[PDB]
């Protein structure tokens, strides 16, 4: 007669292809990529003949087989594809095979194949849009926003985006390489801990706790291998297979390392580490380079060289070559983007007409044109055009787009920036004809998280009432609120200025719109980005 029916032993059923060390703070030790997950299963036979061969099946297919030598057995084998499997133990003899009931086993991987789709309801004022315009609709999500700002991946209105960028992936390096981090308490040290034993110029993760270990919706079980932002992004990719999720390298305080990349030894090491990062974290779809900025004038006053433009063009061509190789290895399309200054003095330091051939999209940072960093020359921080009182204004969106077009950049590559936050000053005084922008300020406006910067949510929630004046400048295409008693002035984007940017993109055949930063919107800004580009509601 056939063997008796085995009973699968109680035991762990959760396994991973990319293992995470739960007691590691250095990136080198934190993740281990294997070619396959090590899986184990045991069984007991409470009644009958134990058979002569025991097998482990996954969805009916043999993953292991060996001699059946007693009432209990154990099998160890490898599983090289992530997902959930119905696993059975079958005992066979010449008279037949008898299979156990199935037990589900989970085989984790960083594409999120083991995870349920994170498909959460839209919050605040976000309304549903269908990405059918063919235009980019992007936004940045910040790693550290999960703490005070309490804005996690399950709160991103993901169906309303084509591109979701993660700021920021740091480049390892200590003294003289990431000195701009020292301006932020504990930040430089944090990177040195993450990069312990790791060469400089290789990428890492700045805050491994936020990126991978903090419990978040959908990834709360103790043995869920990937938690934090990366575990939720993987689940988000299961929910939105076409959303492009790009890791952004750099930003204001993590850009110093780019200034050393004129040394091809360092550049090659960096590019190779980006390739490894994408092989490790499969939910990511390319790389965004946010170098602020070629030529200097970024956070570090001691960096910047006339050689930076060349280095930027080389870097893009080599990134593209690496991504093209990864692309054919995997059958996937990988994207290469960059967030750049929108000021013509900085644009002119790079030959974008050449670099564009390596890039899918150029995220023109048409924001922060003005702000509390300059208390004497006030102006709209993210306007489309110059204002009527100063038609010579250098820093406007159109001027940055025009600088790119004048180099020969194709219009379709250019993605216009929208601000989901305002910049502002306090004590504004000595202005003429009721236009506060003609005076000078005494300091920054009180921000939501930091001086001189205010979330759009707070502008709409608190500064559109009481003594606050509201004006929409139709020449510049920019809103601003002003409190005459304290002289507080805030410049930002609102639904109408975003609609003007969107119409401008469609008229000039530009690539779409992107924003900084997603946690600060209440929905009004992203709704307008979507509507103004022609995306159908629903």
Ligand X SMILES: CC(=O)N[C@@H]1[C@@H](O)[C@H](O[C@@H]2O[C@H](CO)[C@@H](O[C@@H]3O[C@H](CO)[C@@H](O[C@@H]4O[C@H](CO)[C@@H](O)[C@H](O)[C@H]4NC(C)=O)[C@H](O)[C@H]3NC(C)=O)[C@H](O)[C@H]2NC(C)=O)[C@@H](CO)O[C@H]1O
Residue ranges binding ligand X (CB under 6 A) = 140, 251-252, 290, 292, 339, 341, 343, 365, 367-371, 373-374, 377, 395, 516
Beta bridge partners of 40: 76
The site partner of 265 among ligand X, a copy of itself, none (C-beta below 5 to 8 Å per kind) is none
**140 binding partner (options a copy of itself, ligand X, none; Cβ < 5 to 8 Å by kind):** ligand X
- CA angle 302–304–308, rounded 5-degree value: 160
- Quote the DSSP letter at residue 10: P
CB of 115 to ligand X, least distance (A): 28
Q: CB of 294: closest distance to a copy of itself in angstroms?
A: 33
Beta carbon nearer to a copy of itself, 24 or 435: 24
Strands across the sheet containing 37-44: 7-8, 37-44, 72-79
Nearer to ligand X (CB atom), residue 263 or residue 374? 374
Q: Is 104 a catalytic residue?
A: no
Least distance between a copy of itself and beta carbon 416 (Å): 37
Nearer to a copy of itself, 75 or 326 (CB): 75
Question: Which pair of structure tokens corresponds to residue 108?
Answer: 């984790």
Instruction: Give yes or no for a contact between 478 and 384, defined as CB atoms under 8 angstroms apart.
Output: yes
CB of 409 to ligand X, least distance (A): 18
Phi, psi of 22 (to 5 degrees): -75, -10
Distances from the Cα of 148 to the Cαs of 225, 359, 393, 449, in angstroms?
25, 35, 36, 8
- What distance in Å separates the CA atoms of residue 38 and residue 136, rounded to the nearest whole number? 41
The answer to whether 251 and 167 have CB atoms below 8 angstroms apart is yes
Least distance to ligand X from the beta carbon of 517, Å? 7
Q: Could you tell me if 351 and 407 are in contact, meaning their C-beta atoms sit under 8 angstroms apart?
A: yes
Q: Write down the least CB distance from residue 136 to ligand X, Å.
A: 14
Among residues 120, 292, 318, 335, which one is catalytic? 292
Q: Which is nearer to a copy of itself, 19 or 348 (CB)?
A: 19
- Nearest Cα neighbor of 162 from 361, 368, 456, 401 is 361
138 Cβ contact list (under 8 Å, min separation 6): 161, 162, 163, 164, 165, 363, 415, 512, 513, 514, 515
Which of a copy of itself, ligand X, none interacts with 252 (beta carbon under 5 to 8 A by kind)?
Answer: ligand X
- C-alpha closest to that of 437 among 380, 371, 399: 380
* Residue 294 CA to its chain's centroid (Å): 22
Considering beta carbons, is residue 13 or 160 the nearer one to a copy of itself? 13
Residue 45, both tokens: 């036979």
Residue nearest to ligand X (CB): 251
Nearer to a copy of itself, 9 or 405 (CB): 9
- CA–CA distance, 135 with 242 (Å, rounded to integer): 14
Query: How many other CB atoms are there within 10 angstroms of residue 50's CB atom?
Result: 19
Q: Which does 10 bind (CB under 5 to 8 A by kind): ligand X, a copy of itself, none?
A: a copy of itself
Q: Minimum CB separation from a copy of itself for residue 18, in Å?
A: 15
* Beta pairing partners, 472: 479
Distance (Å, rounded) from C-alpha 516 to C-alpha 152?
15
435 contact choice in ligand X, a copy of itself, none (CB below 5 to 8 Å, kind-dependent): none
Of a copy of itself, ligand X, none, which one does residue 373 interact with (CB within 5 to 8 Å by kind)? ligand X
Q: Which does 27 bind (CB under 5 to 8 A by kind): ligand X, a copy of itself, none?
A: none
With CB under 5 to 8 Å by kind, the binding choice for 71 among a copy of itself, ligand X, none is: a copy of itself
Nearer to ligand X, 352 or 367 (CB): 367
Would you say 172 and 204 are in contact if contact means Cβ atoms under 8 Å apart? yes
Query: Is-contact 42 74, C-beta < 8 A?
Result: yes
Q: How far is the CB of 166 from ligand X (least distance, A)?
A: 11
Q: How far apart are CA 142 and CA 146, in angstroms?
A: 8
Residue ranges binding a copy of itself (CB under 8 A): 7, 9-13, 22-26, 42-48, 71-74, 186, 190, 193, 207-209, 213, 222-223, 227
Nearer to ligand X, 50 or 341 (CB): 341
Residue whose pair of structure tokens reads 């696993």 in the numeric block: 87
For the annotated catalytic residues, the residue numbers are 292
């Amino acid at each position: 007669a056939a063997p008796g029916k085995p009973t699968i032993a109680w035991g762990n059923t959760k396994f991973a292809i990319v293992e995470v060390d739960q007691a590691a703070t250095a990136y080198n030790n934190l993740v281990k990529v294997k070619n396959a997950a090590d899986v184990s299963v045991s069984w007991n036979l409470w009644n009958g003949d134990t058979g002569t061969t025991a097998k482990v099946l996954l969805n009916g297919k043999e993953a292991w087989s060996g001699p059946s030598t007693g009432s209990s057995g154990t099998a160890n084998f490898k599983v090289n594809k992530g997902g959930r499997y119905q696993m059975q133990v079958a005992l066979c003899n010449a008279d037949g095979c008898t299979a156990s009931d199935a037990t589900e086993i989970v085989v984790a991987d960083t594409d999120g194949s083991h995870l349920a789709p994170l498909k959460e309801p839209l919050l605040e004022k976000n309304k549903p849009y269908k990405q059918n315009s063919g235009k980019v609709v992007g936004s940045y999500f910040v790693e550290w926003g999960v703490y005070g700002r309490n804005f996690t991946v399950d709160k991103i209105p993901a169906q309303n985006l084509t591109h979701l960028l993660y700021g920021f992936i740091p480049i390892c390096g200590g003294n003289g390489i990431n000195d701009s981090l020292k301006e932020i308490e504990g930040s430089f040290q944090a990177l040195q801990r993450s990069c312990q034993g790791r060469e400089d110029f290789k990428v890492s993760i700045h805050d491994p706790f936020a990126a991978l270990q903090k419990a978040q919706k959908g990834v709360t079980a103790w043995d869920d291998p990937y938690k934090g932002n990366f575990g939720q992004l993987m689940a988000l990719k299961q929910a939105h297979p076409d959303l492009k999720i790009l890791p952004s390298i750099g930003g204001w305080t993590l850009s110093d390392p780019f200034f050393f990349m004129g040394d091809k030894v360092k550049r090659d090491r960096f590019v190779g580490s980006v390739k490894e990062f994408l092989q490790t974290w499969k939910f990511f779809d390319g790389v965004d380079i946010d170098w602020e900025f070629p030529g200097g004038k970024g956070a570090n006053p001691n960096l910047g060289s006339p050689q930076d433009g060349e280095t930027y063009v080389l870097l893009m061509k080599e990134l593209r070559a690496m991504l093209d190789q990864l692309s054919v290895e995997t059958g996937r399309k990988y994207e290469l983007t960059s967030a750049i200054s929108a000021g013509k003095d900085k644009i002119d330091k790079v030959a974008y007409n050449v670099a564009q051939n390596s890039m899918d999209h150029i995220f023109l940072m048409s924001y922060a044109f003005y702000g509390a960093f300059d208390l004497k020359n006030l102006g709209h921080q993210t306007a489309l055009n110059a204002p009527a009182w100063k038609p010579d204004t250098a820093y406007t969106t159109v001027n940055g787009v025009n600088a790119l077009l004048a180099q020969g950049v194709k219009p379709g590559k250019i993605v216009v920036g929208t601000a989901m936050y305002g910049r502002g000053w306090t004590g504004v005084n000595g202005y003429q004809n009721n236009i506060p922008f003609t005076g000078t300020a005494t300091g920054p406006v009180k921000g939501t998280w930091e001086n001189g910067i205010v979330d759009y949510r707070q502008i709409a929630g608190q500064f559109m009432s009481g003594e606050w004046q509201y004006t929409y400048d139709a020449t510049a295409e920019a809103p601003y609120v002003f409190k005459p008693s304290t002289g507080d002035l805030i410049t930002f984007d609102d639904a109408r200025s975003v609609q003007a940017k969107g119409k401008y993109v469609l008229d000039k055949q530009l690539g779409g719109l992107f924003s900084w930063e997603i946690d600060a919107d209440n929905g009004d800004i992203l709704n307008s980005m979507n509507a103004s580009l022609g995306n159908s509601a629903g």
